Symmetry: D2
Subunit: 118 residues, 4 copies
């Protein structure tokens, strides 16, 4: 479980997610993105169901600001962890950019990522 989630994971774009699942339902770690106006690692934080039944529900957020670059945007991934000998985290994500009120209608992208555990 906790053992299940904690580790290094990669998505289909070549991005890397390193996470630790705490006994209280916390997720903490770092994210390194292959795409966008990003470079180096960014802090992530999230939550997971620490007493799952079925996959395990979880979610996390990254604000794309570090000591090197600021894209003025944040992404949230919502999904579930599924274990076995082909462990995966399947998600859908929302990326919101800070915009003026007149451009807010086009502030949010949606997509999906699948993570494989190393």
């Amino acid at each position: 479980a906790e053992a299940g989630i904690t580790g290094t994971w990669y998505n289909q774009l070549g991005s890397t997610f390193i996470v630790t699942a705490g006994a209280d339902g916390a997720l903490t770690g770092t994210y390194e993105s292959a795409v966008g106006n990003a470079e180096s690692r960014y802090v992530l934080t999230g939550r997971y169901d620490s007493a799952p039944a079925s996959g395990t529900a979880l979610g996390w957020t990254v604000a794309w600001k570090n000591n090197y670059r600021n894209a003025h945007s944040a992404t949230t991934w919502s999904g579930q962890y599924v274990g076995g000998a082909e462990a995966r985290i399947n998600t859908q994500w929302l990326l919101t950019s800070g915009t003026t009120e007149a451009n807010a209608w086009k502030s949010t992208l949606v997509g999906h990522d699948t993570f494989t555990k190393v």
Copy 2:
């Protein structure tokens, strides 16, 4: 921001979001839901842009809540993604995704999508 964002907010359904914005970009607090398989408060954690642009744009942010506390566990989690817009009548406009843990056969229908507007009233 932190300043602006820190406080007690309410959405249109009447749920309450109590948050603290750290100088560094962390969001921490509690969420109390008006709907769904929930009772009492739940922990939330998130991140926000601690150095927004100076051209008039909103501040990007996001947070998550897993729906498990000492009273009940819905085996699900919601993530909110959006922007804080300050001023006389500040608001946080968001879109959200709620994923439930399902078997493989029901994975196609695991996630709901919606939108919430939070104010200080």
Copy 3:
């Protein structure tokens, strides 16, 4: 429905949606956008539940617009999915997805998501 749904509607941005609801479930009409790379009217086509439940529920519906007319082509399309709720002050509440045609390298960022509320005013 058809009756209820047929008419001229406006969203919060001021775009205009002129629709006809057929007895059989078809939606046909024109859309004029207040924002984006668009000018004039565009054709839309959709479907709706022509025999909704009688328990007080809304009527499910959806429609699409490709953004190409005789004046301009944005190489994109939006789909709206939602429900019509009748009454004294009828509304259509929707969520939408706008996909642009992109190269393979930019496919990850091809689709925007949002929400629109349409009224008769």
Copy 4:
């Protein structure tokens, strides 16, 4: 192009989509779903960019009512057609169910389907 889109396609769940792309940007056809409260074929209608640049943008809708069953819901797929010797239509979809006003918050599911051409 038009030739490109018109045909029979299947998704990862085993559902079938039969569509004809008209010269005016119309899409018409039928959909047979492998999942949900559905049976037999349903009418679909949509639109596509008839003069694409990059993939070709398109979208379509199905209301899940036919002469045999009514689920009181509709799905819209938004995506793009990409040709080659491995032709595909990649989409994201929204499924909305008719609900009472008190349950409207949970009326809409979101997902993604990839279609392969037969």
